[PDB]
Description:
The chain is α/β, with parallel strands linked by helices. Helix content is 36%, strand content 20%.
Amino acid sequence: GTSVTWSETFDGTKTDFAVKSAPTHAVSMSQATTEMMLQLGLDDKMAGTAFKEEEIYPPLQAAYDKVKVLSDKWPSYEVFMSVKPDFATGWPDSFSKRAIPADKMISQKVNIWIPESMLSTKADLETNFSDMIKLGEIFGVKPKAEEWVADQRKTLAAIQNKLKDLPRKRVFIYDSEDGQPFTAFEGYTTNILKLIGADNVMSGLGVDKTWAKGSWETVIAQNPDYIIIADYGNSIRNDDDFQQKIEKIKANPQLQDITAVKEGHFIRVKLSEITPGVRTVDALKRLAEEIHGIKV
Ligand code: NA
Ligand code: NA
């Protein structure tokens, strides 16, 4: 009988939103929110998706195939409006002037919701769980979301039980480089890796950002045990991007005495696995096995 309510702020303008029934023409502007919605079984309520970045999480591919793709990137306002949307979600940039400004959508009575896990450097795995619950509440499927969170917690506990009394490891996340490495500092990626005893060496350095350029000097000083490398390839059956980045690191004389480099501790991830979405605990299972040598 009560409304599900929330607020968002765009360009200093705060808007209050409410729904009393599930949206029926929802548009997802980002792959991460697309996966969140598909995980909750919401394809029938979806009028469109946008900006696919990598292969859809395989359990969700068949549901993904049921939803109209509006654009390979972000759709124009006209294409967006053409599906009569009533709800939109995505990363914050989806609602900026680089895409479709939120105020234009709000003019047309579209409700906009953004996962809290995507809003600040405070975000952690619990924030992602809460976001899934909230998304569930908005769409009248709270029990489905609670069932998913419950399963994630059970699996996470199984991983952590295997890790009890194993030494923690220091890690460096290598997204890419352009002279300097681009890496993760604070927020979601750092916080979820801490759950499996993997401590981001770029965290705790006073840089309040999710991602930014770092200095190799800093990485060398921190001497990580493992280097986790984001693979930006098309197929999971192809780790060419991963291997090229390994070779780029190996070929850099400045990095040759870093522990991870000497020991060949290179670990492959997709960005979708270490940023908010539905893949986190599944990815943490694999990473825990690779970093700590356990089987869970
Ligand atoms: Na509110
Ligand atoms: Na990023």
